[PDB]
Design a protein around this ligand. Structure first.
Ligand SMILES: O=C(O)c1ccc(/N=C/c2c(-c3c(Cl)cccc3C(F)(F)F)noc2-c2cc[nH]c2)cc1
Ligand SMILES: C[C@H](CCCC(C)(C)O)[C@H]1CC[C@H]2[C@@H]3CC=C4C[C@@H](O)CC[C@]4(C)[C@H]3CC[C@]12C
Length: 241
């Protein structure tokens, strides 16, 4: 067998070990929807309590993406500068892509704190336009019916992007990128799923949405600093201040 069949297996294993929520659990829980009373309870919470909760969940989500990256063949052999450039630019883009597995397009709900709720759950945060954009992005991705292996290989390429500004060893990132591109393309051909390539989000759209999301998180962190369960000092240092 080729390096490439092994690389598909190792990327998918890295994803399985770090996916955070199991797809089978997410799909089984779709009928478990917050009641009108439970939605009102969330809408009445303080902006600042909803921010603490959401910030904790998002921090956590990012940490699973860091663990995913650490398991990607060659990622740990990149210099620390380049690891941090890639994670800073890509880890929240990966969280936004990972959201589609936890999103039900039939009723426009997301799995949050054990049940599915709509964007109105988050009313107290006063972010309706941005949250609507995040839901809309998941709605767009939901139409692809991404397999678990498609998510794994696609999100590896969201991270391993030799075009990110500020890389010091661009050729080393290019080598990992080309092998992951070949892995993804080989896998789509074998599964008769090449049709998804034309349907993937424009890179500018994911970048713009991620930038808007992180900017809003930065504003909340400035107004109301959180306690972070920090595991990755070089990455923490780049995002928190
Ligand atoms: O364990 C660690 O060391 C560690 C380090 C950093 C982490 N995340 C930083 C976040 C946040 C963010 C979040 Cl998730 C919540 C509240 C406030 C923020 C803020 F914006 F303020 F940074 N948003 O984007 C990123 C990010 C990370 C990579 N690219 C983007 C998470 C855990
Ligand atoms: C869109 C809403 C609100 C965003 C509020 C804002 C703009 C202040 O960050 C966020 C809040 C919590 C987020 C989830 C946290 C954890 C996960 C698990 C991960 O595997 C996939 C993504 C997901 C479901 C996040 C989706 C976006 C959520 C609901």
């Amino acid at each position: 067998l080729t390096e490439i069949e092994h690389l598909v297996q190792s990327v998918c294993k890295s994803y399985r070990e770090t996916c955070q929520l199991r797809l089978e659990d997410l799909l089984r829980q779709r009928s478990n929807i917050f009641s009108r009373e439970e939605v009102t309870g969330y809408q009445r919470k303080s902006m600042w309590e909803m921010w603490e909760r959401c910030a904790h969940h998002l921090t956590e989500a990012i940490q699973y993406v860091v663990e995913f990256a650490k398991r990607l063949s060659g990622f740990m052999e990149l210099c620390q500068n380049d690891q941090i450039v890639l994670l800073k630019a890509g880890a929240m883009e990966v969280v936004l892509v990972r959201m589609c597995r936890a999103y039900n397009a039939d009723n426009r709900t997301v799995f949050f704190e054990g049940k599915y709720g709509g964007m109105e759950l988050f009313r107290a945060l006063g972010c309706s336009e941005l949250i609507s954009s995040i839901f809309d992005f998941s709605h767009s991705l939901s139409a692809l019916h991404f397999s678990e292996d498609e998510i794994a290989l696609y999100t590896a390429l969201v991270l391993i992007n030799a075009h990110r500004p500020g890389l010091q060893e661009k050729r080393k990132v290019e080598q990992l990128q080309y092998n992951l591109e070949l892995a993804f393309h080989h896998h789509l051909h074998k599964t008769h799923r090449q049709s998804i390539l034309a349907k993937l989000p424009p890179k500018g759209k994911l970048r713009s949405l991620c930038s808007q999301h992180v900017e809003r998180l930065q504003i909340f962190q400035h107004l109301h600093p959180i306690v972070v369960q920090a595991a990755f000092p070089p990455l923490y240092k780049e995002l928190f201040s």
